[PDB]
Amino acid sequence: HMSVEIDWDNIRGDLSVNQGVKDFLNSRLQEFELPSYVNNLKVTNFDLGTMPPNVILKQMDDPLDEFYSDVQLLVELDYKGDMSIELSADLLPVKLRISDIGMHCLCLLAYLKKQLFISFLCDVSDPLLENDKLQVDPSNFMGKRALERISLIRNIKIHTELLRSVGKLEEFLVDLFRNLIRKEAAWPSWIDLD
Where's the SMP-LTD domain? Predict the structure, then answer.
């Protein structure tokens, strides 16, 4: 494969992208039943890592019909890096730190009318790829079989700051972010950006 190297820090440092996934997060975040004991749970900061992911272009296509309202890249995507998501809530106000967000997955990127959609399709080590049981060639493509799809986030860490009932809370935010990006950023849904 011929690799093409692109500056990471100017992507990482994109005002347009950061304010966008923050918005995306906050937006979809507000669409969840949280427990009685949590309030004003807002995203305060996003940061794509200082570590660039390795990308493999698997396909170029015209953007799928389903951007009903330029270019589409089917892309294997390996993020074993230092992406960090910063947060805040009340209960007592706190500050949360989501880190070490692992990732290895097939992922549609579709740019058109100055928009960029990011749909995570599925994990590269999903067993439903075993016998083309999920059709991930967008030409059959991504059937109902999609429902049985192992989660796209591979690693994730979290720290908090102002016995250890924070555990119960830290299991919760993880089993929330996780459930969000399935619900809202993985196909049929996607992250929208300008």
Answer: 2-194
Phi (first) and psi of residue 104, to 5 degrees: -160, 110
Q: Are 88 and 94 in contact (CB under 8 A)?
A: yes
| Domain total of the chain | 1
Question: Tokens standing for 30?
Answer: 């507000």
What's the order of all strands across the beta sheet hosting 102-112? 54-61, 71-80, 102-112, 115-123, 191-193
Between CA 138 and CA 22 the distance in angstroms is 29
- Which residues lie closer than 8 Å to 145 by C-beta, 6 or more apart? 128, 133, 134
Buried b (16+ CB within 10 A) or exposed e, 170-190: beebeeebeebbeebbbbebb
Which H or E run contains 17?
helix 15-29
Residues in contact with 89: Cβ distance below 8 Å, sequence separation at least 6, in sequence order: 38, 39, 40, 41, 42, 96
